[PDB]
């Protein structure tokens, strides 16, 4: 299938409570494989998946040094963002960054990412061309000028087309047992009378990986998008995910409703009904 690697940075200032906390989590698809936390007793990059543990001592050194240098980088960014937005030193603020690469089944780069947000708003993002930037405002335009001058897009591109895809390739081989296994959802429909003449049909999907799934209800073969209560896909804690979709239907009309399920672990989409 297709695969993605992402690193997620969060840097949070906390005036009066020490220097800003820096955290990094790395993911291949929906699997956490690495973490760093500046608040850890001895901060370093830590393995979070068995297939990453085979990486040698030098890997962990190199990765740890990156995160430690990043801790300082992002604390400066926070101070700089304060100046660019004319903000007081009394408030708590957050910078986030997500970056990485998507690859296709053949292991080739589909696209790269490198996006920053400040206080949850877009700040600066590398364009898909991997050559130019989008600055959200006049503050981010200052960073843009800076990064254009220092040819930062050229360096990101070099990473994204090289080491990003190369390491992802290697992680996928090392974790092929899990990363390259899709677990289809276990699916059932439940029936709950709300009242005399209304019942809830809840279509359940459990035990699936990766997280991407589509669960929809139809009535006489027509999408019930507006009448469907759809919960957010949620982790079970055993690597897998769960989701449900519910529709309220008139008593006796249950058989007019079908649940439809799409997931990459399924050869064909599934159609489900309440089974009295």
């Amino acid at each position: 299938g297709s695969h993605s690697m992402r690193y997620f940075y969060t840097a949070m200032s906390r005036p009066g409570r020490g220097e800003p906390r820096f955290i990094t989590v790395g993911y291949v698809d929906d699997t956490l494989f690495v973490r760093f936390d500046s608040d850890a007793t001895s901060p370093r990059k830590e393995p979070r998946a068995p297939w990453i543990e085979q990486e040698g001592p030098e890997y962990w050194d190199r990765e740890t040094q990156i995160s430690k240098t990043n801790t300082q980088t992002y604390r400066e960014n926070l101070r700089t963002a304060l100046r660019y937005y004319n903000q007081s030193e009394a408030g708590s603020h957050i910078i986030q960054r997500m970056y990485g690469c998507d690859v296709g089944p053949d292991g080739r780069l589909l696209r790269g990412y490198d996006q920053d947000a400040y206080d949850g708003k877009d700040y600066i993002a590398l364009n898909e061309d991997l050559s130019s930037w989008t600055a959200a405002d006049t503050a981010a335009q200052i960073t843009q000028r800076k990064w254009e001058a220092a040819r930062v897009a050229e360096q990101l591109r070099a990473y994204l087309e090289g080491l990003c895809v190369e390491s992802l390739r290697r992680y996928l081989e090392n974790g092929k047992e899990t990363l390259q296994r899709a677990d289809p959802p276990k699916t059932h429909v439940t029936h709950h009378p709300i009242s005399d003449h209304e019942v809830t049909l809840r279509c359940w999907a459990l035990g699936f990986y990766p997280a991407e799934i589509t669960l929809t209800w139809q009535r006489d073969g027509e999408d019930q998008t507006q009448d469907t209560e759809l919960v957010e896909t949620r982790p079970a804690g055993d690597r897998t995910f769960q989701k449900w979709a519910a529709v309220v239907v008139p008593s006796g009309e249950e058989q007019r409703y079908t649940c439809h399920v799409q997931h990459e672990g399924l050869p064909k989409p599934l159609t489900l009904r309440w089974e009295p």
Binding site: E63, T73, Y84, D114
Partner: peptide, 9 residues
């Protein structure tokens, strides 16, 4: 694997 983006805002 990460890379070092050394350049600040």
């Amino acid at each position: 694997e990460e890379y070092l983006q050394a350049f600040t805002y």
